[PDB]
Design a protein around this ligand. Structure first.
Ligand SMILES: O=P(O)(O)O[C@H]1[C@H](OP(=O)(O)O)[C@@H](OP(=O)(O)O)[C@H](OP(=O)(O)O)[C@@H](OP(=O)(O)O)[C@H]1OP(=O)(O)O
Ligand SMILES: [Zn+2]
Ligand SMILES: [Zn+2]
Lengths: 399, 634, 588
């Protein structure tokens, strides 16, 4: 009989549609059917009923039906003892929260955050992870700042990789939508970049990026030179995704320095050859990100754009279409701090012989914006035609 | 552990198991058989699929449902895009899933539906050939559907199925049918896959070890083994026992599983694949001899590699030469080039042909001559120059609802000397060519499938001897084509069942250091078993515990007392120590000791010894050591 | 347990590499190789140290070949059929494909101025190939795993495990990519010892573009003046990258000088094994294959004395024993032509003397040559520099380091840097002498899941501060050879023995006139103030409890002003049942 009810529940939740009055009655029937369930029955029936109620509240649009369903969740989960149902209820509250994010009164947000916090101690490493997820979305500003930052920061030293990663992710989520993360958190993020699991190193690198960007002038030696060096050292990571992410992040910390930024292309304390190492990467998605980040770093700084010319000219003769296009567009965008030159024009103009019509258009656009050498451009452009060249001829004449 | 069943199609599994706080998906596959309910999708085509008669189901009609269903002189078909079927999305949320394990490329084609726009954040694990050939298959489905597309404008039949006639009135779900994923969805989905190899032993988040173990079925096909130091779960999907070009079955490492999940059998089990290959070659030679052509609808990288070789051998031994073959598929050059890269994944006969620098597959030779040609499509440039007849064409989709193959059915259809042969059991052939029924072409249907008919599967299971055997319900169901193992228990899952498998963890592997191991003091308590008491400080740090040596002031000194003392031990050994004035109240079930040095009483029960009255501290210690010297301790 | 390593080659030297690794009752031979600089008895490793005068099949459990270079695989048929070995030999599939070719060519050039073709064939019949990251289970309690190393096609670093001891052997590896052949990759497996090569331990090489620009500029400047360039390489290996980049440069600048490769199924092996190359070849091999050149031509002998300008890739590297040495003899007494040394010259060879600055080359039968040609050493050998060694150390995180394939002073410099940066012990044994490394014991236990769950429930009551400690405790039971950490109740139930408890209460008399409930509350306050580290619960029966202790009152104190208090504790907590009573005796 229990199996038949489980089968009916699976069929109903498969065929149900929460989008398409009677919500009070069906919610109360789900509550009553949850109540009768004995201890040491099938927990999957209770999980099915909770996720039914959760979807039904995810599509509510009444501003009081939402609060009634949230009250049902609070009442049922405050007396729940099985950890599987508790973790699923946390995930259900999480799905309700991100689906609305605007419709819950602040008292209900505080109550849900407190209810999620109460499961952090007795959790089973799945309940704890889902509880930190719910804390991440439901904690507001000025109460995440005073209590939840420290409470989650304790769980960076958790015994489980999922719990550590979720603690760092929840700290990041609190930092995003307003919260004063203290600078003393920085030491806790750096030590989290030595974790054996990529899912923790990823969030730790995010947190180092965030902490170095908003406290740029803190000491211990300037806290964004340290963050720049730390993200530079993450270009040698054992995982491809963290390496791609570090290459993308390296260009976003604009307010770093001169003496530290100029180390990246000045090869031989962790930044001393980082962009050269990233440009000579075997993986395409790392080379592209390194080119884009170097373009961003050189867009504002003139001297770096001068010294970052030979490397990005090198990236022209790369036997991948996307890296070539990225280098060409980056040279198009940078082309205000640079003076072209005959030796550079040699390698640069050797790439005017491509079969696909993406490279020639973009490289025409590059030569139009860029500044004896005038002959060789005309010498090479005349061969390729024998629309794009004429427009490139119009702009080069005007300058 | 649970087992969530998410797939009602026996050929295309999708299961979820929960082993240790982790949800693992096994083989997210695509049900392609629902495309046969729709009409064919030709490239550029005449008024044959236009001006088809409407279907009115003899009862109350609607102004809207008319035009959605049209008949093809015996049968009813939906005028819409194919709309594939997929695993159920609400038994679990696809973001709870932490790891997806893929066995074949064929059991792979529903991955962009799961990984891309859901909340999924985990890893995907497969071998290198499964990822590459699954990339070919996904790119080719997207290509075929996007070459000459239609519009999804046929919803109203779905709400009403009892009206409609026999074949599509049993549509399984039909409201969760999805049309197709896109190319950038393919790119994003396959970017989450990480290459593994045979017998790699990769650690999954500290919870267990995953290992693919080479089911000898496809290029890179594998069976999966999840292991801890005390459990072993084995998943068996592809599994061919016959000898053919992939690396043969490794049943050594499936040997002592606690749970054995079995999924994929022949789907044509009364059939010998070798004699069906022979009938294929006989039929194609006979239609070549009669100045006809042959069309073999096929997958781009499956048994076509064997079809080429066996076809050339039998045709040239039949006195036929200069017979052209064309491979027409938008991934055919990629497939033919990539197939000769995989010498390490092949059987011995083909693998040995690369130590001497030769091509392991013969069809590369056929490309250095002009016996085998390949084109992206029938409209591709250069095809019209090299096309000759009679010929054998290996072309697009076996379903005949999209791809190059549809075109051929229009062109070769009305000549009786031409012939189709269907070699895929996943597509009933009389269902497949149902909208082509004024044909007059031969359409022979010789089914090749080398994957474990029931008589081999019974032998495999009773050779493996698992503790538990978890199978679909249709397997244990009657020519005695059913799995019976009377000496073991069989658990049985239908389409939408959560089944609660019986595997209970009782032990866990931890470590101790040398000093605390030295501190151990064994004491013989029974025949071949000794006891000791352990205390230390724990450092888990992932799941790998380690017991270092040391409210820790008294806790690391505790022993335990066994061997309840007898009557003639305490007073006999307490009389002569210096206190020989023992008063013994020997009550009918207990003993009581009164003593004169201070007010104290020692009460003896057959399972408990205790004191009541105390005094100055030295009074306790004589009782202490006098009791302890002749009572057993750890 | 100890890990003992004796190098029969590549100890404070380069070439003739061979190591003997013993741990856990096993013996493993790493990289049976040969010496180019010598051709006497010390050309091959001295297998007498294992067992003199006989087949070694009972004293070696497996042989492991990293890559196909002859300083690492050259003595393989000699070991397999001269002295004798009828066991398993493990290597990667490209190494099994390519080592016979190099061995046959070296046998051709060696017999003229030794093993045979048949014994090459028979040695290759003992080889069991292995794939990437496959845990090849050699005879029980011995595990082998291959990792990508770079530096030639099919090269590997090997991970060897015997009974909780693991060793990583790099062979030859490059931590930076090149045109083909991506970088070396290892995971954080934390081996007890990492054996690493140190050919370039004191250098940090410039970059891809500086080296490529220097090579291309020198070649172009020399050849545009009518001069000729000689490049001594091996038939397969590092020559393919130089061919790729020279063909790329001469497609770009559209030059028309001739370039020859003096050898012809070599590139079909690179075609068969595309899964061992880098990403940009696996991406483009279907349409634009990089292993046929249409600028490299086959070479003929009569072209040596031509008057034009050419670049010649010659068949033996290092200019030691073949056609490269002949062309070097022919072109040496001329200016405005050069030889480019692209690799490492093992000392005792001609190229080592040339790079050492010698201007006089003395050959056999009194032939003296003045090298008026330009001599340009460049580094295209694809070895790991100092930065690559430090990055491998950081990536895999070993407990010890060992250096083999290099020169002694560079090893000493890198050892000083290793100690300064990682605080690790780095060894460097010489040829013939053994190094021994110690490792803890770490015996494992099969604990009970319920015990661990109870301990984790107790600990998970406060946030996870790493400064506090956990206090697991249980019964350690072992029956056959299996140790088990169980609870008291479970172990006693299983064995069948029951448990005796000795239960100690005592009466303490103190002076009060009020109710005994006030006395109990006063006792609770005093115990909480003086201990402040134990859980004290006042059960509503007027009974105090501390975790095993209950405190009661007898007879309801018939006589006023007198209080009789029962202090009741077990043996198991005897200290906290005794000392605190003394506190009573220090206050009453
Ligand atoms: O009591 P626990 O130590 O928490 O054991 C749980 C519990 O198993 P039981 O309560 O039946 O002993 C879960 O079952 P539920 O009652 O919560 O549904 C079960 O989950 P499954 O239903 O997926 O089996 C889970 O096992 P798993 O490892 O798959 O999460 C298992 O935990 P352990 O077996 O690891 O102790
Ligand atoms: Zn080498
Ligand atoms: Zn070497």
């Amino acid at each position: 009989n229990s199996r038949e009810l489980l089968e009916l529940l699976v069929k109903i939740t498969d065929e149900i549609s929460y989008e398409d009055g009677e919500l009070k009655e069906v919610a109360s029937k789900i509550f009553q059917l949850y109540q009768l369930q004995e201890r040491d029955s099938d927990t999957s029936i209770r999980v099915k009923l909770l996720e039914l109620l959760s979807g039904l509240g995810c599509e509510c649009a009444t501003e009081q039906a939402l609060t009634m369903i949230i009250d049902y969740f609070i009442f049922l989960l405050r007396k729940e003892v099985s950890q599987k149902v508790l973790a699923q209820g946390m995930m259900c509250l999480f799905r309700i929260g991100e689906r609305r994010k605007h419709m819950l009164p602040i008292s209900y947000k505080t109550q849900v955050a407190h209810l999620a916090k109460e499961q952090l101690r007795s959790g089973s490493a799945h309940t704890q992870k889902n509880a930190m997820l719910v804390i991440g979305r439901f904690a507001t500003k000025m109460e995440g700042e005073r209590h939840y930052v420290w409470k989650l920061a304790f769980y960076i030293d958790s015994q489980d990789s999922s719990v550590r990663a979720q603690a760092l992710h929840a700290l990041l989520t609190l930092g995003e939508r307003g919260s004063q993360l203290p600078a003393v958190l920085y030491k806790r993020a750096v030590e989290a970049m030595k974790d054996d699991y990529e899912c923790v190193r990823k969030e730790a690198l995010q947190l180092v990026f965030m902490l170095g960007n908003r406290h740029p002038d803190y000491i211990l030696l300037r806290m964004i030179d340290a963050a720049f060096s730390k993200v530079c050292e993450a270009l040698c990571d054992l995982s491809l995704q963290i390496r791609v992410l570090a290459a993308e992040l390296l260009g976003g910390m604009t307010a770093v320095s001169r003496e530290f930024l100029h180390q990246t292309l000045d090869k031989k304390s962790g930044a001393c050859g980082a962009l050269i190492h990233g440009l000579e990467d075997e993986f395409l998605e790392v080379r592209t990100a390194a080119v884009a980040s170097m373009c961003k770093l050189a867009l504002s700084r003139p001297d770096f754009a001068v010294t970052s010319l030979d490397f990005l000219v090198d990236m022209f003769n790369d036997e991948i279409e996307d890296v070539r296009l990225k280098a060409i567009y980056s040279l198009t965008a940078i082309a205000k701090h640079i003076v072209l030159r005959e030796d550079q024009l040699e390698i640069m103009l050797g790439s005017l012989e491509d079969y696909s019509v993406d490279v020639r258009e973009g490289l025409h656009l590059m030569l139009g914006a860029c500044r004896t050498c005038l002959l060789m451009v005309v010498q090479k452009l005349l061969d390729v035609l024998a629309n794009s060249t004429y427009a490139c001829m119009r702009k080069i004449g005007q300058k | 552990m649970r087992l969530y069943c998410l797939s009602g199609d026996l050929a295309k599994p999708c299961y979820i198991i929960t082993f240790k706080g982790l949800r693992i998906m096994l083989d997210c596959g695509l049900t392609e058989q629902t495309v046969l309910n729709f009409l064919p999708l030709p490239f550029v085509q005449s008024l044959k699929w236009s001006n088809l008669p409407n279907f009115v189901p003899s009862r109350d009609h609607d102004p809207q449902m008319d035009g959605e269903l049209k008949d093809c002189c015996g049968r009813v078909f939906v005028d819409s895009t194919p709309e594939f079927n997929l695993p159920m999305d609400k038994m679990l949320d696809f973001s709870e899933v932490d790891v997806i394990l893929i066995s074949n490329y064929l059991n792979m084609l529903a991955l962009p539906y799961i990984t891309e726009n859901t909340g999924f954040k985990g890893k995907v694990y497969a071998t290198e050939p499964t990822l590459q050939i699954g990339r070919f298959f996904l790119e080719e489905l997207v290509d075929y559907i996007e070459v000459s597309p239609k519009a999804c404008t046929a919803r109203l039949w779905k709400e009403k199925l009892h009206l409609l006639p026999s074949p599509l009135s049993e549509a399984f779900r039909a409201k969760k049918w999805r049309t197709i994923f896109s190319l950038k969805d393919v790119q994003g989905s396959l970017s989450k896959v990480t290459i593994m190899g045979y017998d790699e032993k990769l650690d999954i988040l500290g919870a267990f070890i995953a290992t693919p173990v080479s089911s000898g079925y496809c290029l890179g096909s594998s069976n999966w083994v999840l292991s801890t130091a005390h459990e072993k779960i084995c998943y068996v999907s592809g599994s061919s026992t016959l000898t053919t070009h992939p690396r043969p079955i490794n049943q050594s490492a499936l040997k002592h599983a606690d749970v054995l999940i079995m999924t994929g059998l022949t789907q044509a089990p009364t059939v010998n694949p070798d004699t069906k290959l022979g009938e294929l070659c006989m039929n194609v030679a006979l239609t070549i001899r009669n100045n006809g052509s042959a069309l073999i609808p096929c997958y781009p990288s499956g048994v076509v590699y064997d079809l080429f070789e066996c076809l050339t051998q039998n045709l040239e031994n039949a006195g036929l030469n200069n017979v052209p073959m064309f491979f027409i598929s938008p991934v055919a050059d990629s497939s033919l080039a990539y197939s000769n890269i995989l010498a390490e994944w092949l059987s011995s006969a083909k693998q040995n042909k690369v130590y001497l620098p030769d091509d392991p597959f013969p069809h590369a030779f056929y490309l250095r001559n002009n016996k085998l040609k390949h084109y992206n499509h029938v409209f591709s440039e250069g095809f019209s120059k090299d096309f000759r007849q009679p010929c054998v064409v290996f072309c697009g989709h076996p379903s005949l609802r999209f791809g190059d193959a549809v075109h051929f059915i229009e062109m070769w259809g009305n000549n009786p000397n031409n012939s189709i042969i269907f070699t895929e059991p996943d597509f009933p052939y009389l269902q497949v060519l149902a909208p082509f029924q004024p044909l007059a072409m031969k359409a022979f249907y010789c089914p090749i499938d080398t994957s474990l008919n029931y008589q081999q599967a019974n032998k495999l299971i009773k050779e493996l001897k698992p503790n538990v055997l978890v199978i679909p319900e249709a397997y244990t169901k009657p020519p005695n084509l059913f799995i019976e193992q009377p000496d073991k228990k069989i658990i049985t899952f239908k389409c939408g069942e959560i089944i609660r498998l019986p595997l209970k963890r009782k032990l866990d592997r931890i470590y101790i250091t040398s000093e605390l191991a030295q501190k151990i003091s064994p004491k013989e308590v029974a025949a071949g078993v000794t006891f000791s008491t352990l205390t230390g400080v724990l450092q888990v740090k992932d799941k790998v515990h380690c017991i270092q040596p040391c409210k820790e002031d008294v806790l690391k000194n505790v022993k335990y007392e066994y061997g309840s003392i007898d009557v003639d031990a305490v007073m006999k050994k307490l009389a002569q120590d210096g206190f020989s004035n023992i008063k013994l109240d020997r009550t009918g079930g207990a003993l009581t000791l009164n003593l004169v040095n201070e007010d104290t009483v020692i009460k003896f029960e057959d399972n408990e010894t205790h004191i009541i009255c105390g005094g100055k501290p030295t009074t306790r210690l004589k009782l202490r050591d006098t009791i302890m010297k002749c009572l057993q301790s750890f | 347990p100890d890990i003992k390593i004796t190098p029969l080659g590549a100890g404070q030297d380069v070439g003739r590499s061979c190591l003997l690794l013993s741990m856990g009752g096993k013996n493993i031979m790493l990289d049976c190789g040969m010496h180019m600089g010598y051709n006497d008895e010390r050309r091959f490793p001295d297998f007498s140290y294992i067992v003199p005068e006989g087949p070694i099949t009972s004293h070696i459990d497996c042989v492991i070949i990293s890559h196909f270079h002859l300083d690492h695989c050259g003595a393989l048929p000699y070991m397999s059929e001269i002295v004798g070995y009828t066991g398993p030999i493990y290597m990667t599939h490209p190494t099994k494909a390519i080592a016979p070719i190099l061995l046959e060519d070296m046998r051709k050039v060696a017999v003229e101025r030794f093993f045979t073709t048949q014994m090459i064939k028979d040695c290759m019949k003992k080889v069991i190939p292995v794939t990437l990251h496959q845990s090849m289970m050699v005879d029980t309690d011995l595990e082998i795993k291959a990792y990508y190393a770079g530096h030639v096609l099919g090269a590997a670093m090997f991970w060897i495990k015997v009974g909780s001891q693991s060793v990583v052997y790099t062979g030859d590896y490059n931590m930076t990519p090149d045109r083909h052949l991506g970088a070396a990759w290892i995971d954080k497996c934390r081996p007890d010892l990492l054996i690493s090569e140190s050919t370039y331990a004191t250098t940090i090489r410039d970059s891809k573009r500086c080296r490529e620009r220097d090579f291309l500029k020198k070649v172009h400047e020399c050849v545009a003046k009518g001069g000729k360039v000689l490049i001594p390489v091996f038939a397969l290996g590092r020559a393919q990258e130089l061919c790729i980049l020279l063909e790329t440069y001469w497609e770009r600048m559209n030059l028309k000088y001739p370039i020859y490769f003096a050898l012809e199924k070599a590139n079909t092996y690179y075609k068969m094994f595309i899964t061992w190359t880098n990403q940009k070849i696996r991406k483009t091999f279907v349409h634009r294959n990089m292993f046929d050149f249409k600028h490299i031509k086959p070479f003929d002998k009569a072209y040596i004395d031509n008057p034009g300008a050419m670049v010649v890739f010659a068949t033996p590297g290092m200019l030691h024993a073949g056609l490269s040495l002949q062309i070097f003899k022919k072109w040496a007494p001329n200016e405005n032509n050069m030889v480019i040394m692209p690799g490492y010259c093992v000392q005792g060879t001609v190229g080592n003397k040339i790079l050492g600055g010698a201007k006089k080359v003395e050959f056999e039968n009194r032939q003296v040559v003045e090298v008026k040609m330009a001599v340009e050493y460049m580094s295209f050998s694809a070895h790991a520099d100092a930065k690559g060694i430090m990055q491998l150390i950081q990536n895999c995180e070993p407990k010890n380091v060992m250096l083999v394939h290099g020169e002694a002073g560079k090893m000493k410099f890198l050892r000083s840097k290793i100690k300064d940066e990682f605080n690790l012990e780095t060894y460097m044994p010489a040829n013939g002498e053994t190094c021994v490394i110690s490792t803890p014991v770490k015996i494992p236990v099969d604990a009970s899941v319920s015990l661990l769950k109870a301990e984790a429930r107790s600990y998970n009551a406060q946030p996870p501060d790493p400064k506090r400690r956990r206090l697991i405790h249980g019964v350690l039971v072992m029956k056959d050879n299996r140790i088990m950490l169980q609870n008291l109740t479970d172990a006693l139930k299983e064995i069948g023995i029951n448990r005796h408890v000795m239960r100690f209460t005592s009466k303490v008399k103190m002076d009060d006139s009020g109710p005994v409930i006030r006395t109990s509350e006063r006792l609770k306050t005093l115990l909480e103030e003086k201990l402040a580290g134990w859980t004290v619960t006042m059960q509503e029966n007027g009974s105090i409890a501390i975790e095993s202790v209950e405190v009661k009152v007898e007879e309801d104190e018939k006589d006023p002003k007198q209080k009789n208090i029962l202090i009741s504790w077990t043996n198991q907590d005897e200290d906290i049942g005794a000392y605190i009573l003394n506190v009573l005796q220090n206050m009453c």
